[PDB]
């Protein structure tokens, strides 16, 4: 059905998402060992959330009988330097994969498949939406600085965003 | 670290691996059973390859709230090709079979150690191993029982399938 | 306001619609006389349902102040061999509709109608969606295979199907 | 089961209907591109229920085991020279079909089909009050007149109909 | 995060948008020292849900972390003729509209930003549906007429539509 | 011929557009906080220039079933460029206090014509622009008290932020 190409970024996709995920709750626990279980819970919320990502994308390859050729999942990062470095990495993955998911949309235009592009919309939407919170985390924890109790206060900001999320 | 000993932490990060990997075998061997016209084997992999993450989860969990450091490593790629229902529920007991095994390694060097609150953490996960390896060992016995020369991968689908559900 | 090209399509394709509509009654009536009234329920109730894609350009193009013209509907063919033959068929016959329907996207892409665009995504999706039911119940079919009890069951199957869709 | 000549006269009348049908579609158009939306939704609401009638009478011909030979449907009239004509036209229309539907009940007494002669009762009965409404309708269009604000009050009136009936 | 191009468009927009209110409200006020407190409220009405399509933008450029550079609004055009003219100008207003909204999606094609394709779908789509509402208003005054009680009911015409989108 | 004076007339006319260009100072003043991460000022100002863009119709009603003409002239673009928070919440209370003297202005105006209807009407005009004109003030100097030091600023948007929600 579905071209040659498009199946494999879909999987390639599918990796990403899932690679994703476990550099999430790397980190997440990064922050908890840290004492800084705000950030931890947020991001270990996120991971999860990224996981239901390529759960979707199975579903779609799998209710297009296309095979799921999963390969393997690099180990993520396991140090880091602060709160700031973390969601400032965070943040430039992110950026990552909107642009691997606009590529794949590229391609779908190119082949016209207009009903994998149709799919594709609402996941371009999350993307965009969640490199924003990203960035506004990071900016807000900026703002903050993290001289003295700013590192309480951005870890309480962001445990302020977890809960307001589930 | 400070709490639990270092053996103990070692299984633990393994075991989380262990775990992660498996979810993919699942995965991977759904997306074969789809492929094949058998969705009810492929859904109930499927389901299955979520919850053994959701396991993996928990142990981050746990050694997070222990301030345990988790150190994910790769997760291999699972195999792609198998041969039939049957072989693959075979594989898959076989699998559940090593995993038990894993974890009452882990429940040994508790004991071992004296972790208490550990082992107390791990019985829900001892028996809800248990559980699993006897439900694919039924499985496959049943679809043993069906067999597969007529409209039996059908009907051991929608056996499967049967099961599938009432799990949710 | 649209232009003459999209017009031409669209027009046809409310036709082609229509047409595949008594493509499915015909089919419909053949299962029902062959004993087989899942199959025949189910392709009743997908002819009814491509009426209803019809309908809904013509009122598209009611709204837009576009005239309809409504040519001949062929007539649909009444014999075939099998219930296997059927959904072959049929699976054949909703590829075309599924191009047709592309083509109509193409052009306006090209023509940059993107309301005419935006309005047809809906549409991509439905048969999109029907072009992979009609695989699966043509590989359903085929994994129970037509010896033994085996039409019987495949029409069960389909009755299944054709209850859970109203 | 029933007859050879029964049998002709339903496949007659539903390919009939259908063929209704698309007459009232493409004299919903006219009506809706020359701005009389109120006599484009009456038409067009009139033109489903015609081809419900065809359903009904396929149901029919399949619960008595007997198939549907579809033939093609002719194209429909595009040409209109106004909501008169248009009404005056559909009137005529509807005497036709009232007298095909009679001479089927006709065949049904003189063969004794008691059951169909039965089925039929419905149909009868229905189509004799459509030819009424549209004798009545196209009298209050008369009524009316076009001198001034004519034809937007006979399209009003029209309207008016048409919601009070679904 | 955007490009400067798309940024500079729909800081574009918003000003046309602005703009575009204005204008209506102009023409409001018109209507109602005329007597013609249908028009009057339908555009008034019309011209306060202008206004939100540019707060609707300028959130967008907000969660965006995008600078709003709101320029000067030009006085809009006081004189007009009668209902007619004024629906007519403010067709061609709106298709005006309607083009530069294109010209942002044929950019963010273009450019690829697939997101802000993906935002840009809705208003699209309410800009036609806008577009066709004129269009279909202009077309019942014409039906209507200018003569004896014409002006009337045109006017109550529309106020009945006013009333129907709240 | 119509119920109010020339006058009056020119100075609604002319408050509407004070009351328009006032929204897009607002905005402006919004979209600056908000690409400097203030989202709780920019939120604040955002809602607050909505109800101004409000008062100016309310006027274009008022005009409107007087059966006065509204002359709508052209809107100034408002300022793009500001120092810091405080700088803005001080233009803004200037601004506030400019607004309330045109309106007054018009208030004498009507008293002078005995215009007592246009009087009347604008009551409500009057002690929302007067309570608006506090508003400001209170939360200037609650700025000015917690200062722009190392967290005031942070502080100061969630104070801000605080008084944004609690005003719907």
Not at 11 to 17: W, Y
Not at 130 to 157: M, P, S
């Amino acid at each position: 059905m579905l071209s040659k190409d498009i199946i494999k970024l879909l999987n390639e996709q599918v990796n990403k998402e899932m690679n994703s995920s476990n550099l999430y709750m790397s980190m997440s626990s990064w922050c908890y060992t840290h004492s800084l279980d705000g950030a931890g819970l947020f991001l270990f919320d996120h991971a999860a959330e990224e996981y239901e990502h390529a759960k979707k994308l199975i579903v779609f390859l799998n209710e297009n009988n296309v095979p799921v050729q999963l390969t393997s999942i690099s180990a993520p990062e396991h140090k880091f330097e602060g709160l700031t470095q973390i969601f400032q990495k965070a943040y430039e993955h992110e950026q990552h994969i909107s642009e691997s998911i606009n590529n794949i949309v590229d391609h779908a235009i190119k082949s016209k498949d207009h009903a994998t592009f149709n799919f594709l919309q609402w996941y371009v939407s999350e993307q965009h939406e969640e490199e924003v919170l990203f960035k506004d985390i990071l900016d807000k924890i900026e703002l903050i600085g993290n001289e003295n109790h700013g590192l309480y206060l951005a870890d309480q900001y962001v445990k302020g965003i977890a809960k307001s999320r589930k």
